[model samples]
Target: DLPDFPEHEYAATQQVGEGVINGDLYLTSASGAIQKGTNTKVALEPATSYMKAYYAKFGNLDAAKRDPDVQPPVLDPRRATYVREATTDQNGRFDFDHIPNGTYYISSELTWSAQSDGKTITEGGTVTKLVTVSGSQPQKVLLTR
Candidate 1:
């Protein structure tokens, strides 16, 4: 018989930076201050469980390679392991499914431009978050740098 489980909720705060080479769009860097219930409890669970995440790019998503269309943001390969592979749709959204229930650290090192001085430049930074997964309530991750 399976052990009876109580409802669980997981959530995340998002932070991101611009592509080092592009001026448009935002990338996720970290998950800020996660709390549970009024007492602000931090919950932990088994890794065998699975969790789901819902997120969208919050800023300009213009791709540096193309004008008039938003470009897909790059994610560091090392951090990509924690997330299922994501691809941008026609609407410029990325989604991950069937995520293992656990805490993950993520970062981005995107170069948005290739110009040497003489022009405005952007640099991407790493964002960190501690994701907690429990029951059915979907977790929230805010993206920003």
Candidate 2:
């Protein structure tokens, strides 16, 4: 059985020129029983071929490659294990310190509900973001349900 309130996830990434990067994560509800607020248990990963392929299939790469705000599709099953993770603070914030300069993927899952044929159904899925850290600049990412 699933928990009464499934955990909601979100994340953000940034690159610092010296050797550290910092950022924050947040969750919002456009319309749902889930309250709009901060959350934790965000996962961060390095971008891999599996992620590229996953996005390419759905035509999200074109935009993702060019727009930092644009997110690629979820990573394939095999590549999902390639991740370095961190949990957020009570304020829904996180940091990746002393990391090399490269592209990384941030992700989390949330449950969504809707009415079908006068009945309600719930489904859960992931939300992801891509970040390239080359210089000392903070990056902010936000996810809404």
Candidate 3:
């Protein structure tokens, strides 16, 4: 059975630290298509047991590349409430402010379409990364998968 999300565990993580995360969100692939994902929604999930289980089910940071058709489990509502979101800029860059010092999972879905062989085709999937912020200064990370 999946572990229940503990609100206190999530709440305990939010009440401290002034660290910021500035991340570049994109996907680099063998086909070199849709590498830069602009104006996308980026999510930050605190590293908790529930989150760890979710990650395990999903696999690696580049799972999208391996299984383009795969989808994440529908998040438990209680766990979903703990997630935070931000949007990427024209350069696929995003930032989160006032984050507590801890490990986190950063994720975004990169989907796009193109015309090929007289038909429109859609490709891309969810990509994720694990990052840890341990200081007050801003942390920079490459969020590509």
Candidate 4:
């Protein structure tokens, strides 16, 4: 059985005969000013955009309109699904287990303050990587600020 929500769990049988995929999510400083072990939020989602309308409809609904057969409508697994999320450890490590071989998007957002010349400046942005998993070896993803 698959583990509960918010865990690095996947169903091998769901993809049947597929391999495992794992990776680390980290950020690098363009100016080499930030430390190596920064914490960040990372997410993995199927590399498709069919669910935008479904999610938009769901988001606009009130509790009374959220029936399975009503307002937002039932989720179509082929197009709409939950994203796998994880928080990077002190070393910016995260993993996904038993994932099917397919295309996916890994994303993260980061904010940091750096000293430029003499004043402190705050900067932030999002990083996204398009990855394709085919075998069992682990993958490494690095984002730059």
Candidate 5:
């Protein structure tokens, strides 16, 4: 049987203070040509207890791809409902507003490909980070890979 979606774990109870999260998603090794135009999508999810285990379990599975278990967890629609999103600007800047005081996972992918000498070349993957936002200062995140 598939694992049940942890509804209570992701539910919010009391009123929490609000804060801001300003981020920039860029890849140092990637060329400007690859990063050109594609502003990229930034996602934010609360770092709930279930989410913590979700990342840990999936991360471990990703680390070992050879002969792993057949079943992998898929994100439930309920979980997706909670994720906040933003698109990076030309300068790769993205901002999250009114974020409740807590930790969150900020993620994005900078994937691109180009033709080099009659051959296709691809680069960039995905980046995920845990950021804590609280108080007055906005949390600054640098999504560097």
Candidate 6:
């Protein structure tokens, strides 16, 4: 029988960038700085099962194809565990599934490559959504970088 998981909601309200820079739109990593378009915040339900993830709309397709370097910033270990890799779909859609209940933080770098200029140039501006374990509607998450 399927496991009966409690209903939990997690979401990120921001914009997703194309991960480009210096006329060389590429997927790198998200910087710590929060400029006009390069920042996002994620929230998780503590003690509840949850899944945290993202999707890269456009930009350096090669980067996503090549699967460049992806590393999580230095943060609390507990939080780091929640942020996992979101595989990009054939349509360039990045996402995570079957995540246990908990609060997690996600970064564009983890899913797609940012840009060399430390910012996104040809911003695609994709919107990622976080879903609950009980198969409810996913919450829209916007990111830019």
Candidate that would win on TM-score: 3
User: What C-alpha root-mean-square deviation, in Å, does candidate 4 show against the real structure?
Assistant: 11.0
Off by over 4 Å in 6: 1-73, 100-104, 110-135, 140-142
Model 2 poorest 10 in a row by lDDT: 1-10
- Which candidate number maximizes lDDT? 3
Q: How high is the lDDT of residue 93 in model 3? A: 89
Query: What is the alpha-carbon lDDT of model 5 when measured against the actual structure?
Result: 0.66
Report the C-alpha lDDT of model 5 over 90-129, residue by residue, as the tens digit: 8888887777766787777665665768987656555678
Model 6 per-residue lDDT at 116: 75
Show the colliding residue pairs in model 2.
Answer: 17-135, 17-136
Rank candidates by TM-score, best first. 3, 5, 4, 2, 1, 6
lDDT of 2 at 43: 64
- Residue 24, model 1, lDDT: 17
**Candidates 1 and 3, the one with greater TM-score:** 3
**Cα deviation of 121, candidate 4, in Å:** 1.5
Alpha carbon lDDT of each predicted model: 0.31, 0.50, 0.74, 0.53, 0.66, 0.32
Stronger candidate by TM-score (3 vs 4): 3
For model 6, the run of ten residues with the poorest summed lDDT:
17-26
Clashes of 5: 0
For each candidate, give its TM-score against the true structure: 0.34, 0.51, 0.77, 0.55, 0.72, 0.28
Better of 4 and 5 by TM-score: 5
lDDT, residue 63, model 4: 33
